[PDB]
Amino acid sequence: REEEGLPGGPVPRINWPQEYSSFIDREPVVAKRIRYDTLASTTLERDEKQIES
């Protein structure tokens, strides 16, 4: 995945256009987008050389 260039972190299978229509208030929807967008922009990986050491 890194060679291809896709985001390292997991990405949920969501259709935010539907979520916007479903929810009445944007605040929870915007917060959810902020969390997932931040999650998809971070590499949840550790250095397994030091860990094994």
């Binding site: 969390r35 931040t38 999650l39 971070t42 949840l44 550790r46």
Partner: protein, 57 residues
């Protein structure tokens, strides 16, 4: 020259048998004390969760 030798010769078989049984008992005890110890290591999911919290997500 005659008596003690004869009685020693008579003793030999039983002692040999008993010592063989004793050695077998030692080997059996050695085997019986062997248990495989399965160690438990901190699940990496908690590490991933703590990483997420540190990000302020």
């Amino acid at each position: 020259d005659i008596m003690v030798p004869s009685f020693v010769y008579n003793k030999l078989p039983v002692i040999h048998f008993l010592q063989e049984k004793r050695a077998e008992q030692k080997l059996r005890r050695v085997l019986d004390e062997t248990y495989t110890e399965w160690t438990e290591e901190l699940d990496q999911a908690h590490v991933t969760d703590a990483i997420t919290r540190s990000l302020n997500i």
